[PDB]
Amino acid sequence: MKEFYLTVEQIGDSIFERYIDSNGRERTREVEYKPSLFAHCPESQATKYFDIYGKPCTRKLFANMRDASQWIKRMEDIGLEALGMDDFKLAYLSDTYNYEIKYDHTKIRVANFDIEVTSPDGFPEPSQAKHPIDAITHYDSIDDRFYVFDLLNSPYGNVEEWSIEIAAKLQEQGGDEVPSEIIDKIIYMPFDNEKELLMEYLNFWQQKTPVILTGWNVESFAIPYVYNRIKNIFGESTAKRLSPHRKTRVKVIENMYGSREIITLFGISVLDYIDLYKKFSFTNQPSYSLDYISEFELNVGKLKYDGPISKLRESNHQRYISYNIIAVYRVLQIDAKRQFINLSLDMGYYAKIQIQSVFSPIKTWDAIIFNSLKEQNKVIPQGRSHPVQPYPGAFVKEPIPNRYKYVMSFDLTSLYPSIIRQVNISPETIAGTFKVAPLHDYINAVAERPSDVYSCSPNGMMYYKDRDGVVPTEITKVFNQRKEHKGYMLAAQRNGEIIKEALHNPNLSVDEPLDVDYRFDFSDEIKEKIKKLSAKSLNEMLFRAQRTEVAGMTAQINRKALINGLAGALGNVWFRYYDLRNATAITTFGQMALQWIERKVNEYLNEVCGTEGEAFVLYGDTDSIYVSADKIIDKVGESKFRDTNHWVDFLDKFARERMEPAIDRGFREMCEYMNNKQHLMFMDREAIAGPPLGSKGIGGFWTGKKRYALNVWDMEGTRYAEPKLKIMGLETQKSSTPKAVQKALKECIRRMLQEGEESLQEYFKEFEKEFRQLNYISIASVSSANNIAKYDVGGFPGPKCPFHIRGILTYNRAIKGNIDAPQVVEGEKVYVLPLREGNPFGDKCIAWPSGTEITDLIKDDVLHWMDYTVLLEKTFIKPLEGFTSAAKLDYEKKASLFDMF
DNA sequence: TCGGTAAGCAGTCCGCG
DNA sequence: GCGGACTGCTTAC
Numbered sequence: 048m049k050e051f052y053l054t055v056e057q058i059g060d061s062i063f064e065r066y067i068d069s070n071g072r073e074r075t076r077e078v079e080y081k082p083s084l085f086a087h088c089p090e091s092q093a094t095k096y097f098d099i100y101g102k103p104c105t106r107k108l109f110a111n112m113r114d115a116s117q118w119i120k121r122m123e124d125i126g127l128e129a130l131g132m133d134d135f136k137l138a139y140l141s142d143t144y145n146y147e148i149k150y151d152h153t154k155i156r157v158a159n160f161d162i163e164v165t166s167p168d169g170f171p172e173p174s175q176a177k178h179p180i181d182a183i184t185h186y187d188s189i190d191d192r193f194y195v196f197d198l199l200n201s202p203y204g205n206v207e208e209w210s211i212e213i214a215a216k217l218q219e220q221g222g223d224e225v226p227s228e229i230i231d232k233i234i235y236m237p238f239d240n241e242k243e244l245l246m247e248y249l250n251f252w253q254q255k256t257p258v259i260l261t262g263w264n265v266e267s268f269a270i271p272y273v274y275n276r277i278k279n280i281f282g283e284s285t286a287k288r289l290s291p292h293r294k295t296r297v298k299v300i301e302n303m304y305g306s307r308e309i310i311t312l313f314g315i316s317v318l319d320y321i322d323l324y325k326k327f328s329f330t331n332q333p334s335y336s337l338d339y340i341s342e343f344e345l346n347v348g349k350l351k352y353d354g355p356i357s358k359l360r361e362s363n364h365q366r367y368i369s370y371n372i373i374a375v376y377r378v379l380q381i382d383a384k385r386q387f388i389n390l391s392l393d394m395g396y397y398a399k400i401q402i403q404s405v406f407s408p409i410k411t412w413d414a415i416i417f418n419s420l421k422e423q424n425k426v427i428p429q430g431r432s433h434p435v436q437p438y439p440g441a442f443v444k445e446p447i448p449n450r451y452k453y454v455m456s457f458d459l460t461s462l463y464p465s466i467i468r469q470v471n472i473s474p475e476t477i478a479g480t481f482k483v484a485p486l487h488d489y490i491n492a493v494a495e496r497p498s499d500v501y502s503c504s505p506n507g508m509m510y511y512k513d514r515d516g517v518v519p520t521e522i523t524k525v526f527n528q529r530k531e532h533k534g535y536m537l538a539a540q541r542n543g544e545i546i547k548e549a550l551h552n553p554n555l556s557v558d559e560p561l562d563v564d565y566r567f568d569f570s571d572e573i574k575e576k577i578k579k580l581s582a583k584s585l586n587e588m589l590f591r592a593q594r595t596e597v598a599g600m601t602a603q604i605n606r607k608a609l610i611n612g613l614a615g616a617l618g619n620v621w622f623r624y625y626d627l628r629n630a631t632a633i634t635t636f637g638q639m640a641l642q643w644i645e646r647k648v649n650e651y652l653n654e655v656c657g658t659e660g661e662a663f664v665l666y667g668d669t670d671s672i673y674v675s676a677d678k679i680i681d682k683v684g685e686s687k688f689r690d691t692n693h694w695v696d697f698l699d700k701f702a703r704e705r706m707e708p709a710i711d712r713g714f715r716e717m718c719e720y721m722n723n724k725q726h727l728m729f730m731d732r733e734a735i736a737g738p739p740l741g742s743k744g745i746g747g748f749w750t751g752k753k754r755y756a757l758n759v760w761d762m763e764g765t766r767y768a769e770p771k772l773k774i775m776g777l778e779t780q781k782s783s784t785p786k787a788v789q790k791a792l793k794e795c796i797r798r799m800l801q802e803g804e805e806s807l808q809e810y811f812k813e814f815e816k817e818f819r820q821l822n823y824i825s826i827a828s829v830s831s832a833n834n835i836a837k838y839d840v841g842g843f844p845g846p847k848c849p850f851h852i853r854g855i856l857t858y859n860r861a862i863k864g865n866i867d868a869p870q871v872v873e874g875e876k877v878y879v880l881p882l883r884e885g886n887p888f889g890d891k892c893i894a895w896p897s898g899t900e901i902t903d904l905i906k907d908d909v910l911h912w913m914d915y916t917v918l919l920e921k922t923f924i925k926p927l928e929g930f931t932s933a934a935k936l937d938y939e940k941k942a943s944l945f946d947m948f
Numbered sequence: 949t950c951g952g953t954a955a956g957c958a959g960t961c962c963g964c965g
Numbered sequence: 966g967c968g969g970a971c972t973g974c975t976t977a978c
């Protein structure tokens with residue numbers, strides 16, 4: 048097999064590499080890598096190295112890495128560019144793996160771990176590590192085993208061994224319900240003392256050294272806790288055994304408001320799953336506790352126990368250990384679903400970076416572009432300092448707030464990357480500038496043609512047309528991968544709908560789910576067999592179709608994020624290829640494209656409807672247009688349609704056969720106007736929206752920019768079994784809105800779009816009447832909580848104190864003295880509730896850590912003083928009033944002359 | 949929250965005769 | 966009470 052790296056580090060003048068050799072074996076080597084860097088040299092000199100602009104360079108081979116670094120410094124002291132890859136480990140990988148990496152995940156050791164630490168005096172600070180570590184569960188992907196290290200004797204209690212038989216039993220038998228599929232995979236090791244536990248853990252770690260290290264909050268808690276605890280008990284040298292090269296560094300993580308510390312373990316790649324989730328999941332959660340995220344992703348119940356966690360070990364060690372094991376498994380189950388580890392491996396090896404560098408689009412692209420240029424003996428420029436400067440982004444059209452009955456949307460494919468490719472935007476393809484006209488003049492095709500030679504953007508930039516830039520070349524490669532996966536995702540989604548249809552008529556029989564590849568549209572033979580399946584088989588297939596869809600979503604959306612990251616990196620001062628001329632060339636071209644095609648589509652439709660000056664495009668944002676289709680439907684007449692699906696087909700056919708060719712012609716002209724290298728503005732139909740045939744539903748409404756709802760029947764070729772609400776921006780979509788409130792507002796919108804005014808008034812009246820019964824958590828608002836210190840003045844709100852921060856200060860006064868009450872953590876999220884006048888807490892609101900029950904100390908008083916009226920008005924009525932006035936509806940029946948009968 | 953811009957709404961503070 | 970200037974937070978792209 049072809050070799051591949053596992054990890055790479057620079058330690059002084061040595062590269063330390065762990066890798067898989069040509070026999071599939073894990074090895075480690077130390078290499079005294081001699082880096083090369085580059086300087087410009089005289090034009091008449093025989094060299095094979097040229098910078099990206101074609102200026103000749105001489106290569107400088109250094110005796111070692113420190114010499115190379117020193118040289119860079121002196122080149123700065125002189126005032127001359129020092130060219131080449133200054134991150135020597137990327138040059139090492141480029142040299143050592145000079146081919147497209149083929150990796151085998153089964154050889155990569157992926158460790159998932161979690162620790163427990165009992166603490167009476169509140170949160171066990173990792174940087175202190177003053178309390179014993181009393182449980183570790185470490186799952187190893189190569190052995191497929193959960194290794195459980197259990198402390199039986201502690202200063203906080205001596206306990207009995209954990210029982211695997213009780214762990215397996217149902218909770219109803221007094222057991223812990225550890226999933227039966229992992230019971231045989233547990234290797235249980237009890238210890239008489241913490242020192243033995245930790246020494247055996249290190250020995251284990253040496254034998255089975257993680258390559259990828261993950262878990263939940265491992266980087267901010269488990270890793271520093273374990274390192275510091277071992278450090279405290281044994282000394283530094285023993286703690287450094289967590290690094291396969293015996294090298295570790297305390298690293299300060301700084302943000303705007305302060306900083307924290309993590310431990311860098313050289314020769315390990317830490318991918319903390321909470322961070323993977325935040326980067327790749329495209330959710331925003333009210334809470335990031337493992338129990339909250341598990342429930343969300345997997346529909347598994349919360350891990351239930353009595354008393355505080357600080358007393359769990361002593362009161363119920365059986366459950367304590369079982370929950371530690373289950374916690375480790377829940378991360379594996381989320382990863383089985385989301386496949387973020389697989390994603391990180393793919394992107395990391397593709398770029399030839401340290402796997403953990405997938406968190407940085409700048410590092411990822413720097414390495415892709417460097418490898419690409421290196422293939423042609425080209426030399427990358429030195430990174431420079433730039434002051435941070437604001438620059439302009441997308442155009443968003445101001446919509447007229449209203450109901451909109453029939454709507455078809457269209458959207459440009461991978462816009463920013465497509466612009467890069469079409470225009471040929473790249474550091475080395477800049478050809479010059481032209482004199483810019485107001486954007487309006489380009490939009491209306493009245494400005495002078497920018498160039499007869501070069502490819503242009505309306506920001507004034509011109510680019511070479513003779514060859515592709517490295518940026519267009521490399522972005523195309525990832526775009527093509529993205530396109531493949533989106534295909535599988537969309538096929539899995541269509542297949543899901545076929546299964547949902549068949550579930551209307553499940554067969555009374557005993558059978559099996561079909562063995563199919565959900566990434567591909569079901570054949571006719573498969574569809575026939577489906578129509579004959581039981582509900583149990585069909586549901587199982589649906590679960591599988593939906594997993595396939597999620598896997599595709601992960602693969603496609605994060606490749607989209609990567610290429611969109613390159614367009615954005617051009618406007619980040621830390622990027623080697625930072626250039627506001629290129630960042631703005633992209634965004635400005637996008638503005639033109641949208642408004643250009645708005646004009647074209649209006650012109651096309653005014654023509655086919657025999658009108659003039661009417662606005663058919665009602666809205667647009669960045670790269671999308673929403674077209675009012677009422678008139679198209681009206682030209683046939685509602686009367687002519689058999690059912691909803693009939694007009695959906697008609698609109699689909701109109702968009703494909705009439706609108707899309709018109710849109711294509713408009714963009715080809717624009718390409719010619721701008722003299723671009725390649726026409727890549729492909730704007731396809733996205734949504735077909737409208738009320739159910741014969742209903743009084745309104746179909747859709749806009750309240751403003753980035754705020755709208757539509758009742759969608761077909762999305763990007765997926766024909767839904769049941770219509771789906773596409774709601775953007777509104778409160779149902781915001782993590783800050785209470786859960787029960789999101790749900791009620793969503794049902795109000797459903798009724799508006801699908802059923803009409805009367806149905807809405809029916810539901811509103813009932814919600815208002817019943818809401819005071821709702822569980823307090825479900826009606827709490829949510830907010831991130833920054834600068835609690837800034838606004839704290841002796842425990843009371845300072846000037847300009849934000850509402851949620853006030854709540855925290857209320858909470859802090861109410862729990863003061865209690866070392867054991869849960870603390871609000873700076874920068875994390877809180878639940879927030881308003882409080883009625885004259886309450887014991889002495890203020891108008893209270894907040895506590897999100898994803899938790901508020902401590903028993905005060906729960907009773909909070910429940911009693913909760914201001915339901917304020918809660919209702921703020922989170923429910925006010926947004927509903929916004930929706931309904933926009934839609935010209937009333938959520939309450941207005942009096943009429945009939946109310947005399 | 950270590951890892952592109954546009955723009956919405958909540959809330960504070962204060963004006964607005 | 967509503968709006969503007971401002972901060973804070975959260976979305977849509």
Ligand SMILES: Nc1ncnc2c1ncn2[C@H]1C[C@H](O)[C@@H](COP(=O)(O)OP(=O)(O)OP(=O)(O)O)O1
Binds near residue numbers: 611669670
């Ligand atoms: N998360 C993001 N980060 C950076 N730029 C973004 C992001 N989302 C959107 N943009 C910018 C770049 C996009 O090309 C453009 C239009 O967005 P959008 O329609 O969501 O995706 P897209 O057009 O790139 O892909 P798709 O093919 O799925 O439509 O807005």
Ligand SMILES: [Ca+2]
Binds near residue numbers: 162371374
């Ligand atoms: Ca725990």
Ligand SMILES: [Ca+2]
Binds near residue numbers: 458459460461462
């Ligand atoms: Ca798009």
Ligand SMILES: [Ca+2]
Binds near residue numbers: 549553554578580
């Ligand atoms: Ca059937």
Ligand SMILES: [Ca+2]
Binds near residue numbers: 669
């Ligand atoms: Ca879009």
